[model samples]
Target: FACKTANGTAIPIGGGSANVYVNLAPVVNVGQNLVVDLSTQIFCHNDYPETITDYVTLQPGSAYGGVLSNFSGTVKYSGSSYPFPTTSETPRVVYNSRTDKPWPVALYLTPVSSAGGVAIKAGSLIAVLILRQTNNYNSDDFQFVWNIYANNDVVVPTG
Candidate 1:
């Protein structure tokens, strides 16, 4: 229900004192058969545009292996290529914190849909969301906590 930390320790690659949270309330019972649309969940940002958010299908919270139903945006960069967002079918994403790979998190524009045809183009400014399950399994009964990441690849600034 609010913002909080998700990372426990400083990862070898995603090293930093803190990460951000871009989470939403438990959309429990989200129809599995339905192709749920996702937005660019924004968490943190740098002078550039590195960012981080949470993605989930059956479960929510942290990056885990799952099936990405659908999305519409640009393929910015990866270890392979850095393609900008255009009118096209973007590639699916698979993330692994242990591997330090590109993670896919669901996010919506601040007050708009990035898939709004004319408005939802690539490189559009957005806020990230690191979602969490609406269950009080971990944490001290904190509704849900999210770790903020910025600039898609950069961390939050100290200033």
Candidate 2:
């Protein structure tokens, strides 16, 4: 099955459940090279969509954005840090009234392996996902609790 909006157009962060994973120490810190894996059962389809082409498109029709919750640091290549705490009760996808394309209409956490090798920082962390549909925009929001380490671990050799 595909993740679609009310109109039945398969949309990202709107239809299916996403499982997010990351590789890091028990406590992560600033300037740490972190690997994120947000792939698992994430699929993208559009070979023959109800006799129409959809899901992945370049058509300029929608845009996306949101308010961060608590993050106070920057993400690697993901722009400055902002907080937009999310709740499970909130809708997984949000539609935009204004029609524009801030991001391409491709599957971000597609049915791959992972997002791999991303550096993160300390403080409150939140992840926001936005999508553009045929006539509007959609969004998803989630929060992460990552911590900072004091320093590198000391290794002692024994005789």
Candidate 3:
């Protein structure tokens, strides 16, 4: 999977144990609406096509003093390349200040049909996220994590 800015600046994705993180501090700013495009590809050798769901979460660190507002996302797919497109509902963004560990905001793309699932062709454009930043902070303050899970099936290989 990969995330790229509107100007095509690729944001690197790193991982440790169970999660993958992305640093947006260098390419994002306060009062400047940030637009990011997330994409991925899947490969499987099974006889049948596998249904899958994708998730991307934005979690702020302890020292994060900024607000991310007006979070919106859109799925991009081509019928020829990716036929079985899914995801019916809109992506969500929520903030909970009550907990010591701030809640994460996220976008979800799920399979909508039973027989056919979400189509993810090679290097397909999955979704686009637009967020408005309201404060300033140092690097590593805002961190993002993402994962892709198969729906009641085996894991799909990804790069």
TM, every model: 0.21, 0.25, 0.23
lDDT (C-alpha, whole model) for all candidates? 0.24, 0.25, 0.24
Rank candidates by lDDT, best first: 2, 3, 1
Give lDDT tens digits, candidate 3, residues 101-145.
211322222222233223233232223222221112213222333
Q: Compute the lDDT for candidate 2.
A: 0.25
**Can you rank all candidates by TM-score, best first?**
2, 3, 1
Candidate 1 CA-lDDT value: 0.24
Model 3 residue 108 lDDT? 26
Tens-digit lDDT track of model 1 for 1-159 = 121223322312222222432222212122111111122332121121123332221122222111111332222222222212122223333221222322333331111232221211122222222222212132321123233333222211111
Q: For model 2, how does the per-residue alpha-carbon lDDT over 24-120 read when each residue is reduced to its tens digit?
A: 2322333322222112112233333444323222212111111122222222212222222221122223223233222211111111223222223
The candidate scoring highest on TM-score is 2
**Range of the 10 consecutive residues with the lowest summed lDDT in candidate 1:** 28-37
Model 1 compared with the native: what TM-score?
0.21
